[PDB]
Amino acid sequence: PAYHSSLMDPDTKLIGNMALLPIRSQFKGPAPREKDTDIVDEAIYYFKANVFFKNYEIKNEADRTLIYITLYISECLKKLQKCNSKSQGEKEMYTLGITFPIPGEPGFPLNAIYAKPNKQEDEVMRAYLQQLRQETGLRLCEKVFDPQNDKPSKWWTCFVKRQFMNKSLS
Amino acid sequence: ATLRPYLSAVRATLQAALCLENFSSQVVERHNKPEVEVRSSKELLLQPVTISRNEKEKVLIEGSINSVRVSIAVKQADEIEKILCHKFMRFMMMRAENFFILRRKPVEGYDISFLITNFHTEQMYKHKLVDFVIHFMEEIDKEISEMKLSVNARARIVAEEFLKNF
Amino acid sequence: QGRKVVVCDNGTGFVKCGYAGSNFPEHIFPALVGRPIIREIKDLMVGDEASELRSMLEVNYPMENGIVRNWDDMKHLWDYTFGPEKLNIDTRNCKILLTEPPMNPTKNREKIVEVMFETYQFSGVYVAIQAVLTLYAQGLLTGVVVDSGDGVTHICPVYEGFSLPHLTRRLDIAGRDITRYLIKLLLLRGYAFNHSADFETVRMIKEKLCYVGYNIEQEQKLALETTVLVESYTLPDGRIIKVGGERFEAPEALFQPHLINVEGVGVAELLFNTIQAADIDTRSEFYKHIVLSGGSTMYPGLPSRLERELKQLYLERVLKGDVEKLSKFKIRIEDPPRRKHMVFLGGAVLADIMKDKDNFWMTRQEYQEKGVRVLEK
Amino acid sequence: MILLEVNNRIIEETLALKFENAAAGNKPEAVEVTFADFDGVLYHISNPNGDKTKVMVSISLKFYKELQAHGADELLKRVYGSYLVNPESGYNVSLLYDLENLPASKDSIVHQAGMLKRNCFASVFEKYFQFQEEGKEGENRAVIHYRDDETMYVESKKDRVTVVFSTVFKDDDDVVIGKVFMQEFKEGRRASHTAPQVLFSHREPPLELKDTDAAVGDNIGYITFVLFPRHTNASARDNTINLIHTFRDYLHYHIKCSKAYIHTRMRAKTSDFLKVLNRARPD
Amino acid sequence: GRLPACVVDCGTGYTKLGYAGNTEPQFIIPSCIAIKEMKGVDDLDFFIGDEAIEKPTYATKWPIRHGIVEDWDLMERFMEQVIFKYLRAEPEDHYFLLTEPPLNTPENREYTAEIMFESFNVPGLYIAVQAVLALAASWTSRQVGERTLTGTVIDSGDGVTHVIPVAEGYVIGSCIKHIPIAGRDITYFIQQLLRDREVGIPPEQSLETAKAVKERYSYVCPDLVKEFNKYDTDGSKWIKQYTGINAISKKEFSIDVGYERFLGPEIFFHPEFANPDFTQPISEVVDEVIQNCPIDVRRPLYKNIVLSGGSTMFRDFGRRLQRDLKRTVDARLKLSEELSGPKPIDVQVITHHMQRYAVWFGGSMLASTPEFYQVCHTKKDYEEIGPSICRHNPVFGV
Amino acid sequence: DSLVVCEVDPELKETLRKFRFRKETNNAAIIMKVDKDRQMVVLEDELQNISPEELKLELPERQPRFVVYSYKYVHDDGRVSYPLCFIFSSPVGCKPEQQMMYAGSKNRLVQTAELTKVFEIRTTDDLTETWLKEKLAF
Amino acid sequence: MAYHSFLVEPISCHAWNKDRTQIAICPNNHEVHIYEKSGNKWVQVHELKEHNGQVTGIDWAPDSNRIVTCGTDRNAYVWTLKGRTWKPTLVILRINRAARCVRWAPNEKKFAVGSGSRVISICYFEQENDWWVCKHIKKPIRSTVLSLDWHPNSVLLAAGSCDFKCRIFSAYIKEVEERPAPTPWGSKMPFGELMFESSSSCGWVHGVCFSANGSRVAWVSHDSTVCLADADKKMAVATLASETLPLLAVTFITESSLVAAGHDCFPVLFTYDSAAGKLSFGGRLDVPAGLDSLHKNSVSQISVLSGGKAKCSQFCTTGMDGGMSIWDVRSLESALKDLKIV
Amino acid sequence: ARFRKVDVGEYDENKFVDEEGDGGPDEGEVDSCLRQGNMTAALQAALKNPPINTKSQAVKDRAGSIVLKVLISFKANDIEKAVQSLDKNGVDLLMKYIYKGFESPSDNSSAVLLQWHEKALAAGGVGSIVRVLTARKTV
Ligand SMILES: Nc1ncnc2c1ncn2[C@@H]1O[C@H](COP(=O)(O)OP(=O)(O)OP(=O)(O)O)[C@@H](O)[C@H]1O
Ligand SMILES: [Ca+2]
Numbered sequence A: 001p002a003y004h005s006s007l008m009d010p011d012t013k014l015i016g017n018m019a020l021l022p023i024r025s026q027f028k029g030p031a032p033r034e035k036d037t038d039i040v041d042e043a044i045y046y047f048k049a050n051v052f053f054k055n056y057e058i059k060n061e062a063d064r065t066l067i068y069i070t071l072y073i074s075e076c077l078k079k080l081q082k083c084n085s086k087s088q089g090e091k092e093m094y095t096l097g098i099t100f101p102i103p104g105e106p107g108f109p110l111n112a113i114y115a116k117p118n119k120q121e122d123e124v125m126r127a128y129l130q131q132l133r134q135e136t137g138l139r140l141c142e143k144v145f146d147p148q149n150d151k152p153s154k155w156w157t158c159f160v161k162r163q164f165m166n167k168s169l170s
Numbered sequence B: 001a002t003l004r005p006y007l008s009a010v011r012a013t014l015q016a017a018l019c020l021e022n023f024s025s026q027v028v029e030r031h032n033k034p035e036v037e038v039r040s041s042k043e044l045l046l047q048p049v050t051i052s053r054n055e056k057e058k059v060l061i062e063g064s065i066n067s068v069r070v071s072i073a074v075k076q077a078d079e080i081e082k083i084l085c086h087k088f089m090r091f092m093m094m095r096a097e098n099f100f101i102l103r104r105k106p107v108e109g110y111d112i113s114f115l116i117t118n119f120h121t122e123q124m125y126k127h128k129l130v131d132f133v134i135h136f137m138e139e140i141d142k143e144i145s146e147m148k149l150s151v152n153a154r155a156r157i158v159a160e161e162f163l164k165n166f
Numbered sequence C: 001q002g003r004k005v006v007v008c009d010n011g012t013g014f015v016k017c018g019y020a021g022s023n024f025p026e027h028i029f030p031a032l033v034g035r036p037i038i039r040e041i042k043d044l045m046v047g048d049e050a051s052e053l054r055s056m057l058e059v060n061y062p063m064e065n066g067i068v069r070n071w072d073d074m075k076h077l078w079d080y081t082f083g084p085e086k087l088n089i090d091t092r093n094c095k096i097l098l099t100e101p102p103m104n105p106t107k108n109r110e111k112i113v114e115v116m117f118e119t120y121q122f123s124g125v126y127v128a129i130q131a132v133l134t135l136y137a138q139g140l141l142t143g144v145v146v147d148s149g150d151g152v153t154h155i156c157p158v159y160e161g162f163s164l165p166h167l168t169r170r171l172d173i174a175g176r177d178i179t180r181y182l183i184k185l186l187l188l189r190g191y192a193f194n195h196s197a198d199f200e201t202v203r204m205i206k207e208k209l210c211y212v213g214y215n216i217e218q219e220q221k222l223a224l225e226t227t228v229l230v231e232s233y234t235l236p237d238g239r240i241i242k243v244g245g246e247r248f249e250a251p252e253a254l255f256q257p258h259l260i261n262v263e264g265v266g267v268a269e270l271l272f273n274t275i276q277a278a279d280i281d282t283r284s285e286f287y288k289h290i291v292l293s294g295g296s297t298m299y300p301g302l303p304s305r306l307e308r309e310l311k312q313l314y315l316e317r318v319l320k321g322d323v324e325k326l327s328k329f330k331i332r333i334e335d336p337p338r339r340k341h342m343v344f345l346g347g348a349v350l351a352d353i354m355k356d357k358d359n360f361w362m363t364r365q366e367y368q369e370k371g372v373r374v375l376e377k
Numbered sequence D: 001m002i003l004l005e006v007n008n009r010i011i012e013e014t015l016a017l018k019f020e021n022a023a024a025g026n027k028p029e030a031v032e033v034t035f036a037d038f039d040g041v042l043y044h045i046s047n048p049n050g051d052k053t054k055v056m057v058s059i060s061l062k063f064y065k066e067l068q069a070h071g072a073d074e075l076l077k078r079v080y081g082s083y084l085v086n087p088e089s090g091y092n093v094s095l096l097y098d099l100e101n102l103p104a105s106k107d108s109i110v111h112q113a114g115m116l117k118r119n120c121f122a123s124v125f126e127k128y129f130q131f132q133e134e135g136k137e138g139e140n141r142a143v144i145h146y147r148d149d150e151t152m153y154v155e156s157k158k159d160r161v162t163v164v165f166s167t168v169f170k171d172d173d174d175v176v177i178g179k180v181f182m183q184e185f186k187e188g189r190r191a192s193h194t195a196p197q198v199l200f201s202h203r204e205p206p207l208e209l210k211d212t213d214a215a216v217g218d219n220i221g222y223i224t225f226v227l228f229p230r231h232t233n234a235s236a237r238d239n240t241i242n243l244i245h246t247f248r249d250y251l252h253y254h255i256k257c258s259k260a261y262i263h264t265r266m267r268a269k270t271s272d273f274l275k276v277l278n279r280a281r282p283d
Numbered sequence E: 001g002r003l004p005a006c007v008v009d010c011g012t013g014y015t016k017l018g019y020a021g022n023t024e025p026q027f028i029i030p031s032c033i034a035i036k037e038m039k040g041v042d043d044l045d046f047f048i049g050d051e052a053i054e055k056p057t058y059a060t061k062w063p064i065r066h067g068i069v070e071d072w073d074l075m076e077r078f079m080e081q082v083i084f085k086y087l088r089a090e091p092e093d094h095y096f097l098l099t100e101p102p103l104n105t106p107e108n109r110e111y112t113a114e115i116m117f118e119s120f121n122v123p124g125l126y127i128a129v130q131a132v133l134a135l136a137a138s139w140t141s142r143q144v145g146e147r148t149l150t151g152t153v154i155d156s157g158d159g160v161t162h163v164i165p166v167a168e169g170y171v172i173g174s175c176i177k178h179i180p181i182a183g184r185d186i187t188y189f190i191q192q193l194l195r196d197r198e199v200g201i202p203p204e205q206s207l208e209t210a211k212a213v214k215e216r217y218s219y220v221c222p223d224l225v226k227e228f229n230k231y232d233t234d235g236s237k238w239i240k241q242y243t244g245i246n247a248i249s250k251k252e253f254s255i256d257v258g259y260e261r262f263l264g265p266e267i268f269f270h271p272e273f274a275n276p277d278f279t280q281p282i283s284e285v286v287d288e289v290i291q292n293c294p295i296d297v298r299r300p301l302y303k304n305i306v307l308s309g310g311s312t313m314f315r316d317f318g319r320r321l322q323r324d325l326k327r328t329v330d331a332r333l334k335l336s337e338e339l340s341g342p343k344p345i346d347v348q349v350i351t352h353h354m355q356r357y358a359v360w361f362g363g364s365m366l367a368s369t370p371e372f373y374q375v376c377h378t379k380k381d382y383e384e385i386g387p388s389i390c391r392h393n394p395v396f397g398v
Numbered sequence F: 001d002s003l004v005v006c007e008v009d010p011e012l013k014e015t016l017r018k019f020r021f022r023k024e025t026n027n028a029a030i031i032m033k034v035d036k037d038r039q040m041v042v043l044e045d046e047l048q049n050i051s052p053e054e055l056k057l058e059l060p061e062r063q064p065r066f067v068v069y070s071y072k073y074v075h076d077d078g079r080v081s082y083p084l085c086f087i088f089s090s091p092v093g094c095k096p097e098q099q100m101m102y103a104g105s106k107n108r109l110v111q112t113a114e115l116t117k118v119f120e121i122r123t124t125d126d127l128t129e130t131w132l133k134e135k136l137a138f
Numbered sequence G: 001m002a003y004h005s006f007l008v009e010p011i012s013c014h015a016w017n018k019d020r021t022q023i024a025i026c027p028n029n030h031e032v033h034i035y036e037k038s039g040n041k042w043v044q045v046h047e048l049k050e051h052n053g054q055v056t057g058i059d060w061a062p063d064s065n066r067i068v069t070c071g072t073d074r075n076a077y078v079w080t081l082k083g084r085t086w087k088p089t090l091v092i093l094r095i096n097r098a099a100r101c102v103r104w105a106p107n108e109k110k111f112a113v114g115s116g117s118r119v120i121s122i123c124y125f126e127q128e129n130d131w132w133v134c135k136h137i138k139k140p141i142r143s144t145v146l147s148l149d150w151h152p153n154s155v156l157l158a159a160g161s162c163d164f165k166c167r168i169f170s171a172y173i174k175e176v177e178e179r180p181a182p183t184p185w186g187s188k189m190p191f192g193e194l195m196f197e198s199s200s201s202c203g204w205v206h207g208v209c210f211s212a213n214g215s216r217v218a219w220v221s222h223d224s225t226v227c228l229a230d231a232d233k234k235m236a237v238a239t240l241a242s243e244t245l246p247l248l249a250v251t252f253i254t255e256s257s258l259v260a261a262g263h264d265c266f267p268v269l270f271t272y273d274s275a276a277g278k279l280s281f282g283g284r285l286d287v288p289a290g291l292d293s294l295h296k297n298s299v300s301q302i303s304v305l306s307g308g309k310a311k312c313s314q315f316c317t318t319g320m321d322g323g324m325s326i327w328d329v330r331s332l333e334s335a336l337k338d339l340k341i342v
Numbered sequence H: 001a002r003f004r005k006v007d008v009g010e011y012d013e014n015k016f017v018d019e020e021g022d023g024g025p026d027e028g029e030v031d032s033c034l035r036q037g038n039m040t041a042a043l044q045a046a047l048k049n050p051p052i053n054t055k056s057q058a059v060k061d062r063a064g065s066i067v068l069k070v071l072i073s074f075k076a077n078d079i080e081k082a083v084q085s086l087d088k089n090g091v092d093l094l095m096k097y098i099y100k101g102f103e104s105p106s107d108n109s110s111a112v113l114l115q116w117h118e119k120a121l122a123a124g125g126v127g128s129i130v131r132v133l134t135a136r137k138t139v
């Protein structure tokens, strides 16, 4: 079946019911310092497979973070499809970070599975999802664009219409 | 020419013959059988009667307290009509589980026989069944005429299609 | 006090238990004891539960042909009958009447008395011969009991209360074998059934639709010349099938054992041959005291067919063909409406009318004092 | 399909496939095929001694010895020549085709390969067509036992050439259907004034084939084709042989097809009766 | 006698027909028939197989739906040309072997026989159950060791994928499960992936190409992500190229063939990829069927899982199934240890050379033997006893 | 084997004693009943000058009854006996409970009475002089 | 003209309770359904599931409020309403073929069951054993008994059979009732005595009925005739041959008027002119699938809802069409003005 | 032995048997009406003294022939008046003779019979036919 996150550490804090997993990013936010592999690398390595699956059992909190990034990866591809350069893809992945609803608000069409945020849990959730959106968008820009040259690769653009669990952030 | 008076007669006879009711065997414990088939209780058989249109086309009706057996001698003008009739009656008899009232083999010396139990007159309208048997008698005569013309017609075409090529 | 009695006919197929003075058995369920193969399933399953999950348990019948083969599993089955899920009784404050099947070894007969007093500690126990109960239940002491159940069919001469071991014959054809045969017939009709997997589904088709033909040549003429025998039947999976002449062909195995490769004569010829090997004076008295019992005697037409078949035999091989003397042939094959569980019905009545007596019930006092047995016949 | 095809499809597709692969220079494929034709014919396509570059097509007819008597070998020598070799064990005629050494136009040899059975039959007609042409009247008639219990009699005359089939109807219903088909052949020159004449007899043979053992029967019938110079000449010779020798099977084909159409009629009406019955229910 | 029996396997997509004795069918034609959009001989104006697919003025009709015959008029006409055009068998001189789907009603058996005997006058008929013929075809690769008719059969074709348990030649009909994934569904899903990614394929030949990618380039992978990883890591070594011919312009067109290579056959193991109404992987379906069968026949069924049909021809299909099935059965059978207190269950999926046409091949071998003529129903019996006899065709061959 | 569902009344004991050595030489009969509340076999009636057909009519058709019949049997030889026939009338339609009390009490009554000519009928219609004499031939 | 379709299969038989609030029917199977009326609607209140074959007769003892049933499984049950539930008591009929019809006597102390055993079973309750006893009337019955009706004295009992005869028997059971006072039918009425037998030698006798005062018996046969004998005129037999299809059910509505129904599917009136000694056809009572009658299939039973068989004002018909119709005789007399009862 | 085939049901004492070949129409009687042209009188003559009670098949056939002759001699339009002359019992009897006439059809005696059946049916209703089937002693 589908692919789950195997980075579930004994001392991993939460945010809602998502795991607050560290990332190795240059964007500022409420993530811990991150050696090589993290939840965003795990999400991209797994993306092309998971996106076909409709059903998904949630083994632990780390999977809810994995799901979110997977869904967002599809939102990047929708926007990357029209771009004319790896540089322009970065402009709009910055824009796609700055632009979406959270667990509780009109979905985020998964309010059944995710948990709601008080003041402190709410402002941190906004900012952690933002840091995921900004770092995921950045790494995708390297992966999606072909250097011969500056068009998006059809091997990432062919996934643009496929929806993970038939859910979408747009 | 003499079809319509003959059917009107067969109808009224069926109308009297299909006055059935459910009837438990008085011979075998907790059994239920069409008495016209088993014939083991003589007081329960009604007098057999024939209606005949001529020497070749007739109907025999065998009534009983819970079952009726209509058997039909069909018009068969010539050998080709005979074999079409036999092919066709055989075809419908093979399908006799779908006709709930059709008998798998005809009474000896007839082409096709119906066996209508009290269970059929209970779950269908008895006057519609009568309508059906009269309907059936008409239509198998039409259908044999169709099939007879059909064979003649394709015989012509097959003879020409071969000969026009010499 | 007062109370409290209980009764138990341990069938090969089905356990029928209830209370003295019951008119139907208060519980009927398969005589079954299934262990699981893998990890609300318990370490063991009995009766209804065990039949329900039968595709997941290695299942055992401790009764083979009316006799106990496995005393271990038999204990579990008795724990189930008495235990909460059925009777919920304290065995120690109860009397109990059991039935013993034909030609049971006294080894077994003993061991149960031993089991009942040692392992369950009933205050009162009694053991009745089936054939004698079924006759006592109808105001009879002499006579012939035809018991056809699940495993085997027994023909049991009884004389003034005593069963006769050396005139009691068996036919290794009954309920299971007919269900099994009907599967074969539905197979030849073109339905891909399985003898194991679909035994229960076809058993219910048999119970629901099969009957015994009175005149087989005539039933075959109906089967072959009409569709009046044909019936739809909806299977568990939803599929509908047609059952026709196989309705009477399946139970015909009772009268014609060769139809399922079984040596012997078939119940009517067997019954005739057995009655005929007795005293001239007791022959008369047997022929007018034939009694049916058990589940496989419920097929519509069965008693008529037995009557007819005995007359044909007596005419051909006793009256040597002349029908003028047939009229004198007195013959009674009584088929009570409650004949399916006569052994229980008889035992329930007897355990009731004998409940508050003293010399009847063999006591725990007696067996400890001792010992097995403790029989007073 | 009204007219039955003359050529064998299994021979042609086997060879066309094989020859297409040789013309590309692909690896020679192994082959072993055992199949039939009408009139008890048995074919066999194979590689002799496992040699996969060579493809042998053999044919076996139980009445070849009779065709051989009427110039079968010399006709087959014309048509195939180099391709024709010694017959395989059990068969009468074998063709051999070298995949390393084939013609440019592949379609020519493949067409003639598919006409092996036909070309076996053809000799006996060409023989009698020219008896009539040259005017050699009063020759022996030919008797070909193309089936075990059926016989073709070919006979040359002053002005005409007669071909008589003595065919059998196993099923008794087929006799009566065949009778109706034959009746239209007998009144068949209403369509074509120029076509051959066709005579029919139900049990006993014509005045010609009477006797030297012509089997009389209730399930037998004698169809006689009276061909003329117009049909037997060199310009229309091959066409006539192609029709005339498939005639028996064309007749039986159409009897069986005729019965299959009767079925679709019977399904229609039976289906209607069942609807009418079902409308007799309260629902 | 002298000349071999005719053998016909009629499937949803393809009819395979030829003479008994042969290893492969003489023709494999599409199971369609083209007809007019009536008296005379208009019933005869039709075509079947390939010459019927795109016929200008004719309607192509598919009389066999999901294995089972829908239209008997058209099935009968299809038979006319099978016998007289393609086989060129004098039908009166040949016994016939016809196949039936797993869920074929006994009424259908009669309708079939009626055609063969009443129309074509065949001297003998045998309606074979397909699962039994596949089992026999796999005896070519066992080989003499345990050649038996007890085993689980995966028949996968164009229409329907079934899982059919068989016990001594007798199908266990109550435990048959089917899967909504078949050939056509894979072709359709592969065609989908190509439109999303590739261009240059002429719309007319989108299925044609998808079929060719399916049959010539596709395979079953051990793990999905690792394959996606190979393709993104290497790319040059896993992305193959296919070039077809444009049917109108006759010049070549060529495309990349990538992810669909392994994704297409994956839908057997993750049907949810192309199927909303079904999610259960084939490995689980096979396990479930065998667990529904009787205790004392499961181990035999497990060790003889025979593959039949064209949609089982994918590379590594058998090995993938065996592995996923052994993971389920061993993981389950380890708890029975850790919750106590079982013999290691031997699982074997059989791949063999005759898979593509398993059914037909088995049928050809059966019809070659002497005992086939002994278990065939004759016309004499069909007439004297009646059509009932064709409801049960005796199993034999062990 | 060892069943005495109902015992035999001490008074009935005697009646059967005296009847066993009866000096009178006509046809006579004692008819006996099972008392439900007392659970004992008791006397119902004593009747004198009765043919087999007349005794038949005295019996309940749909209730079991025990009978002891002193019947003057004229043998095939011509010379005469007064055998004490015991007859168990056990009709078919009767209460199961009632049948069990009769069936279970018969053997105790028969040894108590010390009779050896023991018969049983399913219907009173069977109790005739041909039937009684047929059985006595043994 | 008050038709209600309870179902679409037959109603085999039916019975009404005393005050006609509830109707019991067998919907062509092994069970009996009891429907109570609630305002406009009929509502099912009870299922009586004990028979193991089709139920052929149902009768409701009005004062004792006990239902008796008989079926093809050879059995009969007396049903007794215990609290909220009808509980059944098996009656040993001792018959070896199916039961066919069952009617309590007026006195409610016993019921009669006709069967295919060529015998009538007369059952009464034995107070000491708490047990249903039953005696058989055998001769001269030579076939199945299809119908029964009691004389008002609860002793004489009419029967119609497939041997083509209507008979009157004495079902006198000394252990439950006073000896009967003599009737025009006769003075000697021991159990089983044959008081009268019809002279018809053909036509199965489908229904039979006694008059209100019991002097006259009327029956209908399968030769499309209706007949009547009055013991006042030395058992003289009045006969009438019908132009239409056989009748299956009959009842007196006055001492000299009859209502009958059968395979035509509508009720018809017959008047008996005592003086001229002849039966007269009073005409069709049901006046307007394709059928013009209320019932769309044969009427199998007809029963008097009120006024008894002396002055019947309402009567009931059940038929093979699964319909039950109520007929008000005053309403019928308003519609057909040229219609004369008595 | 196969003792099973012997039909023991033949010797059942309870089984039903029909009660009663005790003591036709007159030839010259009918031919006096027939030569005269009085067809209605000829019909009323042939319906006298039907051999219902004899078991002799011959005398029943004798009677059938005689009744059939009258019906054949009629002209189509004349039939209706002759049938309406008969009382209900004559009409019911005519049916019995008509149904017997159907068993022996030629000379377009069958064509006229069907018309006789039509008038008979109007007169006596379907019940006149019911009494043909129901009758145990018949013509
Ligand atoms: N109505 C019925 N008709 C026919 N067969 C039945 C019917 N009801 C039950 N059976 C069959 O009879 C058998 C049950 O009868 P019963 O309970 O007397 O057997 P048992 O007591 O379990 O076995 P045994 O009598 O061998 O000890 C089963 O095999 C069942 O299929
Ligand atoms: Ca038992």
Ligand SMILES: [Ca+2]
Pocket: E009, E010, E011, E012, E130, E155, E157, E309, E359
């Ligand atoms: Ca297939």
